[PDB]
């Protein structure tokens, strides 16, 4: 479970902190939201695939930032992450991802598949309880929101997914990306 909400101000990400293999919870504290400089990603699936994609993308963001004299745009890092997912189609990184950042073009939110398909959308959820959470988002999303009101919408939608999905549960972190503060 992971939720992104696009506001006119900035993109808000939030996801669970629960990992269960089979019918048994191994950990009540498994980080599924990660920071990349100005950007931030969060996904669901196998944890090891998600962790190595945060680390690979962190390295190659530093790759682009050290060579060219311009800081990375979110569309460029998204197409990069789509190609990284796409080269390994034979053995796919089993993880659906949400990519969120703010560029000079504006706030941008992105959906990535293990094959590597890039989708732009305003609001999205990913994982087991995503069905439930998008229901809450489909009830109460408007294009004109504030950053902290979208925080409360993400808490309401994630709390609904906690109460009605067996694979999700307690432990919520929220990443508020306006341009000034990460």
């Amino acid at each position: 479970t992971a939720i992104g909400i696009k506001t006119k101000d900035g993109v808000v990400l939030a996801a669970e902190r629960r990992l269960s293999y089979g019918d048994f919870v191994l950990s009540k504290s498994a980080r599924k939201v990660f920071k990349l400089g100005r950007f931030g990603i969060a996904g669901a699936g196998i944890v090891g695939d998600i962790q190595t994609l945060t680390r690979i993308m962190n390295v190659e963001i530093k790759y682009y930032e050290m060579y060219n004299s311009r800081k990375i745009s979110a569309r460029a890092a998204a197409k990069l992450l789509s190609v990284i997912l796409y080269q390994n189609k034979v053995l796919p990184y089993i993880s659906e991802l949400l990519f969120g950042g703010v560029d000079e073009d504006g706030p941008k939110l992105f959906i990535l598949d293990p094959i590597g398909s890039l989708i732009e959308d305003s609001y999205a959820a990913v994982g087991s309880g995503a069905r439930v959470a998008i229901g809450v988002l489909e009830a109460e999303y408007n294009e004109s929101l504030t950053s902290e009101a979208a925080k409360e919408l993400a808490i309401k939608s994630m709390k609904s997914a906690v109460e009605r999905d067996v694979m999700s549960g307690d432990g919520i972190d929220i990443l508020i990306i306006n341009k000034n503060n990460i």
Binding site: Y64, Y67, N68, R70, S73, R75, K79
Partner: protein
């Protein structure tokens, strides 16, 4: 300076200079005159097209090459060395645009081009390139960016240069009357005047302008 050390290319002279690299720079001094100017309003680079035989396609021959829709460049010296180097440049540019879906910084284009020149000036059974390049583009968020590739592999970013047979004469003319606060009709005039100190329709001219971020030919 001791000049018995001209064997192969992978050998330092006792002063420390590689003589074959300097000999390759003599090969671009024997090339045709090519010019590149950048001011503030955009980009002009051009090249002389001398007619050695009355039965030559002066208007059919090509020396201005378009690396991407936003970067063009010209070469002087040999043709084939800078031409296989132009194939590597276009391939690297389209590879960067396939990965990031983004125009390419010119420091990175000239970087990987110049790194190829270094790799052929450090291995035994490979002749160095006898071609110098001058690269002009404006797809960056700032303003224009001109670079020049030397067969040693060095960068020099320039406001305006020219290399070839009449390269030093145009170099001293552009030393006389250059200035930044100037526009695009006047900078293409300046490059034509810098080639005149050294003709009906026997010159290739290409310009990139900062308003619509693209590169075109004439």
């Amino acid at each position: 300076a001791a000049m018995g050390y001209d064997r192969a290319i992978t050998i330092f002279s006792p002063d420390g200079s590689l003589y074959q690299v300097d000999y390759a720079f003599e090969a671009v001094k024997r090339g045709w005159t090519t010019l590149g100017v950048k001011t503030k309003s955009g980009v002009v680079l051009l090249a002389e097209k001398r007619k050695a035989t009355q039965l030559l396609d002066v208007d059919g021959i090509e020396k201005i090459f378009m690396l991407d829709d936003h970067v063009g460049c010209t070469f002087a010296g040999l043709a084939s060395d800078g031409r296989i180097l132009i194939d590597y440049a276009r391939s690297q540019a389209l590879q960067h645009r396939l990965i990031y879906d983004e125009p390419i910084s010119i420091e990175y284009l000239t970087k990987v081009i110049s790194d190829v020149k270094q790799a052929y000036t450090q291995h035994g059974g490979v002749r160095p390139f006898g071609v110098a390049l001058i690269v002009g583009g404006i797809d960056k968020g700032k303003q224009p960016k001109l670079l020049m590739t030397e067969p040693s592999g060095q960068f020099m970013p320039y406001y305006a240069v020219a290399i070839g047979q009449g390269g030093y004469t145009a170099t001293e003319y552009l030393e006389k009357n250059y200035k930044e606060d100037l526009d695009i009709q006047s900078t293409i005039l300046l490059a034509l005047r810098a080639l005149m100190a050294t003709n009906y329709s026997s010159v290739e001219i290409g310009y990139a302008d900062v308003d619509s971020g693209t590169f075109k030919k004439l």
